[PDB]
Design a protein around this ligand. Structure first.
Ligand SMILES: C=C(C)[C@H]1CN[C@H](C(=O)O)[C@H]1CC(=O)O
Length: 250
């Protein structure tokens, strides 16, 4: 009947409109994407913000998945539409549609990863949890392995808790702090006032964000075909351009 969609606040994907109720309280790339996939697939839905404010990781002790991934695995949500990075660990427990948006870990400064690894004057870090941190932690690639060893033992801490915190740290560090984040957030922030940040070098890896559903879900097939169709029509490119560039501030 009414499909339960779990999502999360992260600009410009899902934001509180700056007096409203239900789905109309929200706006952003993922809000527009949810309406488009629902329209194509022919379903009614309710957007809900994930209670724990997490994307999805499996606790090492309890082995239970938290965040949006957890909501899908334990049957609390029917679908997740947000900047949820497609990773192998998540793919083992949930299904992802083809990418609706491409990205890679990138560097934000006020070059290359190899260049950051060989130096010591500019400090660098990632979020204290998430796919970016996990990529560095489990990487068997020499340069990233070195970067991780440096980040985990750096004092004071080079890690931050939110995107906003990583961005602010870059802005106030006089070129002494580089933030490692997904290229999509990097591109978005570059077009946000005070317009003083920049992406440098190529991405460290390659992946995307995908619509997620519980394993064996009936909705899976349909949502995947919808993503392929919206992509083919150029709609996803227009939608990214709308939220990143048309609404840019620089
Ligand atoms: C915004 C957050 C915390 C998310 C977005 N995609 C990643 C994920 O799905 O884990 C996280 C960012 C990152 O790890 O750099």
């Amino acid at each position: 009947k009414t499909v339960v969609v779990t999502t999360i606040l992260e600009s410009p994907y899902v934001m509180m409109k700056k007096m409203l109720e239900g789905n109309e309280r929200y706006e952003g790339y993922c809000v527009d994407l949810a309406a488009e996939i629902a329209k194509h697939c022919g379903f009614k839905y309710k957007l809900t913000i994930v209670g724990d404010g997490k994307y999805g990781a499996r606790d090492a002790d309890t082995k239970i998945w938290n965040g949006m991934v957890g909501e899908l695995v334990y049957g609390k949500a029917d679908i997740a539409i947000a900047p949820l990075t497609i990773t192998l660990v998540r793919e083992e427990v949930i299904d992802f549609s083809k990418p609706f948006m491409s990205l890679g870990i990138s560097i934000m400064i006020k070059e290359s990863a190899e260049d950051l690894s060989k130096q010591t004057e500019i400090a660098y870090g990632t979020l204290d949890s998430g796919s970016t941190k996990e990529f560095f932690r489990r990487s068997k690639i020499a340069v990233f392995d070195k970067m991780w060893t440096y980040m985990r033992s750096a004092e004071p801490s080079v890690f931050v808790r939110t995107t906003a915190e990583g961005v602010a740290r870059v802005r106030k560090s006089k070129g002494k702090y580089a933030y490692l984040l997904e290229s999509t957030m990097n591109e978005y922030i570059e077009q946000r006032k005070p317009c003083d940040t920049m992406k440098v070098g190529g991405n460290l890896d390659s992946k995307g964000y995908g619509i997620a559903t519980p394993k064996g879900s009936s909705l899976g097939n349909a949502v995947n075909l919808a993503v392929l169709k919206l992509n083919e029509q150029g709609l996803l490119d227009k939608l990214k351009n709308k939220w990143w560039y048309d609404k840019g501030e620089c």
